[PDB]
Amino acid sequence: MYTFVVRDENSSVYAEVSRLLLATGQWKRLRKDNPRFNLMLGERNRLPFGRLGHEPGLVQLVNYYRGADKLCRKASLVKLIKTSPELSCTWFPESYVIYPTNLTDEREVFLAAYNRRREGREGNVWIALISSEASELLDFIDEQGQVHVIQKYLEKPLLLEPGHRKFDIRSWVLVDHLYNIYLYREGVLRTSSEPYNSANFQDKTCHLTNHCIQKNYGRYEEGNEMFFEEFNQYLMDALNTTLENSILLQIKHIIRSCLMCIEPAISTKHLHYQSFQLFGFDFMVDEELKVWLIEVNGAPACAQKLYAELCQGIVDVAISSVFPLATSIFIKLHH
Amino acid sequence: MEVIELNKCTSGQSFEVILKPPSDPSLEEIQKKLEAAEERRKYQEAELLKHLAE
Amino acid sequence: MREIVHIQAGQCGNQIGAKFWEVISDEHGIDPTGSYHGDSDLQLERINVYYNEATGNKYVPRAILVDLEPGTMDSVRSGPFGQIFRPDNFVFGQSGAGNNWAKGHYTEGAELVDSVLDVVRKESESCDCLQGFQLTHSLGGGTGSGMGTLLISKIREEYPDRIMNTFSVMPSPKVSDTVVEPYNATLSVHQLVENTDETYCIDNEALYDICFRTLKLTTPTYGDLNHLVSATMSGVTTCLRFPGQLNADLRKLAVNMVPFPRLHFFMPGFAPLTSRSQQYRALTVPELTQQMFDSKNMMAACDPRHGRYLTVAAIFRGRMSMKEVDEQMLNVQNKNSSYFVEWIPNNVKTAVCDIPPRGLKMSATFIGNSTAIQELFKRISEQFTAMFRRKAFLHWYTGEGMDEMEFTEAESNMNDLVSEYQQYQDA
Amino acid sequence: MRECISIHVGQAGVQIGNACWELYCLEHGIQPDGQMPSDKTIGGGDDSFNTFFSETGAGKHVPRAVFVDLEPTVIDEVRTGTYRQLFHPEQLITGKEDAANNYARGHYTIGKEIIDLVLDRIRKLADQCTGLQGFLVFHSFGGGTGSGFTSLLMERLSVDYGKKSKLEFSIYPAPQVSTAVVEPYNSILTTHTTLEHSDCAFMVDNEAIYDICRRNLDIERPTYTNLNRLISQIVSSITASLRFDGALNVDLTEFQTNLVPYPRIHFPLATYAPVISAEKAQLSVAEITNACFEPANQMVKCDPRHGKYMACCLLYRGDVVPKDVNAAIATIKTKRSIQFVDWCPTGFKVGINYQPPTVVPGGDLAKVQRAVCMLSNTTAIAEAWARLDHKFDLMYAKRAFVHWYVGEGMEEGEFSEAREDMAALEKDYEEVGVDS
């Protein structure tokens, strides 16, 4: 009889996972502060990693990699890609980290590249707000307070037809305790219902493809979400190519590069406790069918349609692999 | 990258390699503590003996 | 060398006390004459804890025998190991206590108590470093209950910095002598709550049920019940009698088992349950571990699943794999972690002794501080109140000068004890 | 030459003391009867080994050590053991009854009645020193004597020997071999009291040593004898520089200078390699140096990758030359996560002793041609404080077992004052170790 505890009631993913564990009858849920657990579905912040792996007679597993925030924090991701010999790449938009005036920092470096754009008469649209003036951006950062990241806004994205629609690709990636990298075969496209506008950047509604902001909603596809089977068919009909060739190869490449980079820092191969984690990679595709990494989410939600399959997959290769009970939905990105 | 202060002898040797440059209570007080605790013990024992006498 | 002074009072106290000395004398290789004839060196390593030494290498139990009537102590002296006891340590009266707490505590017992304290004093003055006292007695009678608790109070007065430990037999209507037993028990519990550090609660109800159901004894006698008691007492004192790291003395045991001063009443347990009927098949370590935690092996007639474990001490005896012992002990805690308080980390401690008890290749003894023990006190409290509300049988006590208010106070304190257990059961 | 006095307190301190001095005798060629054939200066001298051993006119080399326990059982085994002739009775101090795993009992009640006797016996050893460096104090965190009396002794040593350094070898409590439930209490109480009186403390987690003995020595259920022989090897690696000719850590103050930039943060993490079973029928400099950054070889299980280094020292014994070390370090640096604080240089202080580690004949440890002990002051060791403080908080919130301490004359407020000091300590590690 395996045991586990829950310390994130707000996780839609692991609320489903814990439900499946109970359905097996071989898993029992304990109170939050009960130390005698095999599995910990931890909290998003201040997870007590230092207290794990010190219970004799217990193999302990946690659903988060300590140090993965380096990849999942926007300010950290930029620092990571720039300062890592393995990463410093063509698949990440030009980015700089900016600290407010009242709060080292690369502001004079960002303006250095800003000059080439304006004195080159090319694309000089950037995103924090999406403005073409560095003044309107910096004045916005100092006014907020928190640390913001300045990134080149891809002005020429791939547009869905009909509708001239902008989109982003979400990929779910599970990394187990052996640091096997598993890409869920089912991804999702978060689409904009409004037509893409080139002139007015003030209307961030069509530019931002967040599901919450979108919610013209549900006109084309249900819930402003296009899945891979439909999107593949689109690419075959419109561009005479497949999703695997034009996009997924790049996606699998980027995921490998990012996760293999930080592997020696976060691996629990010889640790007194073991980790796995579900990641949410967000991608951007331009008109030349080139894939750009936007960000990595450490605590991602899933598509309502895909919760049942993904969460079961998490139980099978990440949890039951460590705790065996008495084809695959994942693509193993080997290394 | 840089080995400095190499000292050698028959028993062995020692050195330093740098990879990157940088970027009380008195005796009386103690006795006072010990005596304060002793008296608290004495007080508790006295209360017990008083209770038992009752 | 930390000497313990043993005291046994009343009929029950002397009968389980005698049996106890009989059992551990055999374990330590001491014959009824008092001469050593064992083979292992481990037997004599810590024999000073319970035995004094006389010239000619004679070993005399540091035991004091007390009763307000000579009957039971006459039988002890005629018993198998009757000659091993120091004749000076027999302190007895003639009047008896008539199953009356007041007689033991206030009238008949008060006349004899100084004589006992004289013997206690003489034994203590011969101790290099006395660690404390252990008392065997019942709570349902007069001498063991009344005079026994009077002795404890007077011993605490003279030796306030020593550990007081008791094996206290709790009354049950299933195995009852008189109807005033809940009175005597409640009055005694009041005393034990304030004046002992450790009390092993030995329930006659549990002893009866074990003999009847598990041991298949159709009509168990006190002898059958005492067979279980002596086996349990042997187990719980194992760490005191043989070299070891865990709970090797009375104070270290109390520090590990008692988180709150009033909550010091322990549920003892033993495996395998044997009839006074030899066993040929030795139990595996998982079997010993599973049975020792089973309610059917508890000596307090309380269901530990109805409460929570504050602290647990486990003692495995015999030649076995300590690795397998650790694995099995951790397994019990991990499967049933809901029954162990989380606000006391690692509250389960395990010890292993190489010397098994007679007739067994291995055994396990369980000592638990569970909040489920409140069921025992609630049982007594209800039996108490049923009579006291009608003031039934009270004249036996007021006739000895006691007032009703003393009964009310005793009842109030025991009820408080119950609520304190419930408090930490919901903590 | 400057002398060092060792002080062993409580069962853990004493039993580890015997393991260490037994090992010392084997390393220096000292026979159990105190004789040392290779010592030509009879009944005197100022060699490096004289830091730990004094000499009598009869050619006997006796340890500059005092053994103190509130119970006679453990030290009595020293009085009748194989190395009984090594010590003289004045060095071996025993009380009548112990502190019963109660800090308050060891510190206040029993400590008060025996502290002057202990200090006087120490004074006798110090009077025989031409130039005393200071003291090495061996004790457990969880024991009543190890926690309670040690803290009192450390206070009194600071008064009697203000200029002298004080080093600690402390046994951090682990449930697998623990014998008390209140050990977190004792740990915090003694850490609070000893904190300002200790210049450098090497914590050893019994959990770490336990698992190493199982994993690497194939011992199913490790005993104290198993644990202590491994511990004594680590202790020997740390003190070898004081006992042998060398240029690194040849003095007690150097430990503080090289490992402790900030006084309160004086708990260096020790890592040792290789640990090879004697029953099993040779690792290079690169391999054993790489093992120094494996949590499975550390004296305290924690993750240095998620902390910062303030200082690092490499102590090699055996067939090792500087070229091998530098090549090894160069490879490791580009292979692992080694972050130093900004205000400290990123580097290693290396010490090599050509004499390979000595093992006890018929022991569990195999003879190796080269070994290494890494001492690194990393903020990751604060994980051990966090674990300990959490267990403290769980019990103290209910005031569990507190009456045992108050009963000995200690005030309840000392608990909170001790816990607040630990909270401050955890904050100190946070500021030094984390970015934001």
Ligand SMILES: Nc1nc2c(ncn2[C@@H]2O[C@H](COP(=O)(O)OP(=O)(O)OP(=O)(O)O)[C@@H](O)[C@H]2O)c(=O)[nH]1
């Ligand atoms: N490594 C090691 N740890 C030990 C040894 N003896 C005891 N310990 C540990 O130290 C703690 C027990 O404290 P002790 O040192 O035995 O207690 P003490 O210092 O004698 O103090 P008292 O309470 O008076 O007995 C537990 O965590 C034990 O696991 C030993 O020989 N080696």
Ligand SMILES: Nc1ncnc2c1ncn2[C@@H]1O[C@H](COP(=O)(O)OP(=O)(O)CP(=O)(O)O)[C@@H](O)[C@H]1O
């Ligand atoms: N450089 C860029 N070029 C084009 N679009 C961009 C962009 N940077 C961000 N976006 C748009 O912003 C949207 C969401 O931004 P982002 O995901 O960084 O915010 P967020 O992290 O608060 C949402 P979540 O983390 O939950 O996925 C994306 O759908 C994308 O279309």
Ligand SMILES: Nc1nc2c(ncn2[C@@H]2O[C@H](COP(=O)(O)OP(=O)(O)O)[C@@H](O)[C@H]2O)c(=O)[nH]1
């Ligand atoms: N287990 C056990 N219980 C006993 C024995 N003798 C008496 N009792 C119980 O003890 C209570 C009677 O007290 P008793 O010791 O006879 O009175 P005392 O001699 O005045 O102390 C009743 O609850 C009996 O069931 C015995 O030998 N064994």
Ligand SMILES: [Ca+2]
């Ligand atoms: Ca009379």
Ligand SMILES: [Ca+2]
């Ligand atoms: Ca008299």
Ligand SMILES: [Ca+2]
């Ligand atoms: Ca000499």
Ligand SMILES: [Mg+2]
């Ligand atoms: Mg009777």
Ligand SMILES: [Mg+2]
């Ligand atoms: Mg001790």
